[PDB]
Amino acid sequence: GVDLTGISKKSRVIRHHTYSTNPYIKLLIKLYKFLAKRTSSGFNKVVYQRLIKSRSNRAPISLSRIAVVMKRKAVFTAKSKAAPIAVVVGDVLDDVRMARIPAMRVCALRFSKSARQSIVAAGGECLTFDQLAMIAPTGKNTYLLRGRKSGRESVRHFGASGVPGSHSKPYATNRGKETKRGRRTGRSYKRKAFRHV
Amino acid sequence: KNRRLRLRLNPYVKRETAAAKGMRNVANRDARRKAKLARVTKAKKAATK
């Protein structure tokens, strides 16, 4: 025998196939699996990994977020160079809080109907991942983007709300209930809002 | 032990075994034993005197 204590703890949960039943997702995975192994680009490898990911791990992105980070890169970019193609492995959703956006080329798995209308009306173009593979096979001049997930309600519930320093929402259908003892100093004690780590 | 593998890893091994054959030659071994003892003994006497 060989002493291999805790060797199984070194292994990691790595998925190679997708759980998706979408045939067009499988076509994209087939296309970008080929590109991630026959090209040297790091963009194709990252895109291929994100196509295998679950829906929860492909958070959607707002149109205002794309335009903001595009402007942060538009400055400090030479006028000779064209703007990169924004690529997100996920959904692009419209944002009613920002009406005036520049013309951008956006590639995404799915566009909401309003988001596609807003991109086109600004002079931009909504791209498709098989179109991207033909104009940027190695991902040259692209802006890979991810949607936000820290604001999800599931994340806001994670952890115990009764321990000091915690601010997670409890699981409760009634908002008025679960507010008296343990939440106010007058009723026995209050859960401490801050704790040094 | 393999001839191919030893030569492949060590291209110089042919010269090493040729030297080994010489030291095991009876005439070479006996002549060297006589010469080595005589020259070491002469050096020992000269150093002590």
């Binding site: 805790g6 703890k9 400055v75 400090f76 801050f194 040094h196 780590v197 | -």
Partner: protein, 68 residues
């Protein structure tokens, strides 16, 4: 019927299976809450000015890049 009262047997083995994790580095979670207030208040004034300096400095860099 009496049973065992207490033992620490196997506890060190249990604590080392997923190992004893090291402490968080000093540069993380270095909150100043609860520290000496007079120094805390003065540090906030400097940090507020530093943010204003950072905002202005990016404005100069953007104009300088567009200058060429």
């Amino acid at each position: 019927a009496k049973s065992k009262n207490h033992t620490n047997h196997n506890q060190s083995s249990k604590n080392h299976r997923n190992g004893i994790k090291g402490p968080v580095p000093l540069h993380l979670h270095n909150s100043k809450r609860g520290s000496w207030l007079p120094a805390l208040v003065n540090a906030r004034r400097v940090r507020k000015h530093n943010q204003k300096a950072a905002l202005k400095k990016r404005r100069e860099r953007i104009a300088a890049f567009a200058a060429k």
